[PDB]
C-alpha cells in the first residue's frame, strides 16, 4: 500500500511534465519556424500558452492536493490557485472556440476572409477570450466569501464555494462548456457539410479530423462538467476518486491540444523533432 502513493505522483507528475514540454515545443516551434507563423497559428500560440500555465501550475498543485489528502497551503493560495486554474482553463476553451470560428470563416469565405483577416484581429480575439474567461470566473470565485460573509470552504479541502449554490454553478458552467461545445460542434458541422460535398477524400478526411477534435474536447471537458451538475443537487453523491478523475480528465485536454491542432498538421511535427537532437 506504500507503493501506491508514489505511482500516482509519477503518473500525474510525468503527465504534467509531458504537458508543459509539449506546449513549450509548440510555442518555440512557432517562434522559430517562420513558415508556420500564419494567423491561424497565433490562436495556437495563445492556446499553447494557456495549456502551459495549466500544465505547470494547475496540474502540479492538484497533484499535491490529491497526494497529500488535503490542501495545506491556506485559503489565500486556494482562492488564488482556483481562480487562476478556472480562468486559464476557460481561456483554453474560448481559444478552441475562436479557432473553430476562424476555421469556419476560412472555409465558407475561401478567398475573401483569409486576406481580410489581419493579425490585429487575431490578437483582438485572443485578448477577448482571456478577458471574457477572467470576467466570468475570477470575480465570482474570490469575492464569493466577501458577499456571503462566510468562507464555506472547509479547512482541509479547497473547492469553489459557489458549488453549494446551484443557481450560479449552472449559469457559469454552461457559458464555459455547454454553450461553447454547442457552438463549436454546430459550426464544425457547418464546416464539414459545406466544404466537401461514399465521398473519397474531402468529406472523409474533414469528418475524420473534425471528429478527433470534437471527441477530444468532449471526452476531456464533459465528465467534470456533468459531475459539477451532479454534485450541485446532492453533496454525498460523488466519490472523491471519481471527482479527482474528472478534474484530471479536464487537465489532459491541455496536454492533447498540441496533437489535435499542431501535430495534426504535417509540418509541425517535423519542426518538433529537431528539438530532440
Amino acid at each position, epitope marked *: 500500500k506504500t507503493f501506491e502513493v508514489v505511482f500516482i505522483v509519477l503518473v500525474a507528475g510525468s503527465l504534467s511534465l509531458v504537458t508543459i514540454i509539449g506546449n513549450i515545443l509548440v510555442m518555440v516551434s512557432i517562434k522559430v519556424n517562420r513558415h508556420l507563423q500564419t494567423v491561424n497559428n497565433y490562436f495556437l500560440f495563445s492556446l499553447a500558452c494557456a495549456d502551459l500555465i495549466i500544465g505547470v501550475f494547475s496540474m502540479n498543485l492538484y497533484t499535491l492536493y490529491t497526494v497529500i489528502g488535503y490542501w495545506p497551503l491556506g485559503p489565500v493560495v486556494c482562492d488564488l490557485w482556483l481562480a487562476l486554474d478556472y480562468v486559464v482553463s476557460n481561456a483554453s476553451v474560448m481559444n478552441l472556440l475562436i479557432i473553430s470560428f476562424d476555421r469556419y470563416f476560412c472555409v465558407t469565405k*475561401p478567398l475573401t476572409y483569409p486576406v481580410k483577416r489581419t493579425t490585429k484581429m487575431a490578437g483582438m480575439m485572443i485578448a477577448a477570450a482571456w478577458v471574457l474567461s477572467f470576467i466570468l470566473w475570477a470575480p465570482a470565485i474570490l469575492f464569493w466569501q466577501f458577499i456571503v460573509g462566510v468562507r464555506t470552504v472547509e479547512d482541509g479541502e479547497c473547492y469553489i464555494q459557489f458549488f453549494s449554490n446551484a443557481a450560479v454553478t449552472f449559469g457559469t458552467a454552461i457559458a464555459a462548456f455547454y454553450l461553447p461545445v454547442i457552438i463549436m460542434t454546430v459550426l464544425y458541422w457547418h464546416i464539414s457539410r459545406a466544404s466537401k460535398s461514399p465521398p*473519397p477524400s*474531402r468529406e472523409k478526411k474533414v469528418t475524420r479530423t473534425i471528429l478527433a477534435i470534437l471527441l477530444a474536447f468532449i471526452i476531456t471537458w464533459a465528465p467534470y462538467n456533468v459531475m459539477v451538475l451532479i454534485n450541485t443537487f446532492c453533496a454525498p453523491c460523488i466519490p472523491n476518486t471519481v471527482w479527482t478523475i474528472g478534474y484530471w480528465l479536464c487537465y489532459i485536454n491541455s496536454t492533447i491540444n498540441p496533437a489535435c491542432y499542431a501535430l495534426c*498538421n504535417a*509540418t509541425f511535427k517535423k519542426t518538433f523533432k529537431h528539438l530532440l537532437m
Partner: nanobody
Amino acid sequence: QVQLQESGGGLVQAGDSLRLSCAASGFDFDNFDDYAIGWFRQAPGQEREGVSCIDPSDGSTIYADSAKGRFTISSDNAENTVYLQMNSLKPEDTAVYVCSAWTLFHSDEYWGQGTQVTVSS
C-alpha cells in the same frame, strides 16, 4: 518541402487570353493531393485579392465574384501542376499573379513568387 513557380506571364491586348501555370514540387510524407491551390493577383498598392481557387483532390472549383465567367482552372493530379487559363482580359487585370497552397484549416500555408501579367489597351 514545397515551393511554387509560375508561368505564362506576358503582354496581351484587351480581348486576348492567357494561361498561367503553377508548378509545385518537393513533396515528402505530404501529397500534392493534400494541398488546395489558388491564384492571387496584386495590383500596385492594392489589396492582395484572390482570383480563383481549386481543390485537386475533389476537383471542386471555387471562383471569386469578380472573375466568374472568364477564368477557368484545372490541374494535372499526377504531374502535381495546376493550370489557370483566363479569357477576354481587360486592362484592369494588370497585376502580379502568385500561387498559394493551403492545407486543411490553413496550417501549412505556402505562397510563390509570382508572374507579371500586363494587359494593353
